[PDB]
Amino acid sequence: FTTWTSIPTLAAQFPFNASDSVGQQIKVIPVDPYFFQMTNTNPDQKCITALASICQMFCFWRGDLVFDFQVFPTKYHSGRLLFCFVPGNELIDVTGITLKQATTAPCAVMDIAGVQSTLRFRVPWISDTPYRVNRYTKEAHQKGEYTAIGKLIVYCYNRLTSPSNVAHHVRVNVYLSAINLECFAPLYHAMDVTTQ
């Protein structure tokens, strides 16, 4: 099955406007292979990633995930982003973290212009249990069993300075893949779009 899981597919989509202050939070991502939010109208369908259509058939999962951010700038914009990873679970109160407070957590910066346009971001495995359960079959919550190892935050580390005859926003695609992955205990379940 690793022929499907080790190939990155598109999962998310977000813009980077020129009218944001330094330290504004752009997009939050729960860290799990069950995440996907794209959809289409003609025909009526909810799109899926390749990683979500393997791990939706197992009770447990384990391994490092690889986020790939791809920007689409011109040659003439400038600015810096700050990706931050907070360890935990799928539900904590995360938007009280200020920009200076995010440097305690492991983080990395990205320069927009240049000849490279892809940042491969490998998330380590930080947990207290060896395997992390699938819960989306159930309906009620329970403290102790979870679906995530923490969340990810996308900040604005430097603003977008640009000329007049170019556009005012740069769109970023978010890919999704895995490495050193392991699953067991099969079942059947159809996923649903996580509306973040």
């Binding site: 099955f1 990395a108 892809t118 940042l119 699953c183 067991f184």
Partner: protein
């Protein structure tokens, strides 16, 4: 060349079948001291797309407890439906 043409730019082999054994096993730091060249890349080059990424200091996970692997088709779909 069979066709007698010419090519310097290459679109390499894509979607390698059965790339990795799906049990967490071993074949010391995996990532560490050396600066990450896999942290930054270009996804539109199929040559540079297959490089193993690293950004944080990690090490080896270990070995699983259950003997057989549940990520092979012949053991997954061996169960009836």
């Amino acid at each position: 060349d069979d066709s007698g043409g010419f090519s310097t730019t290459v679109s390499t082999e894509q979607n390698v079948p059965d790339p990795q054994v799906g049990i967490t096993t071993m074949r010391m730091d995996v990532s560490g001291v050396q600066a990450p060249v896999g942290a930054i890349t270009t996804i539109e080059d199929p040559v540079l797309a297959k490089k193993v990424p690293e950004t944080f200091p990690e090490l080896k996970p270990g070995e699983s407890r259950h003997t057989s692997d549940h990520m092979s088709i012949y053991k997954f779909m061996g169960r009836s439906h």
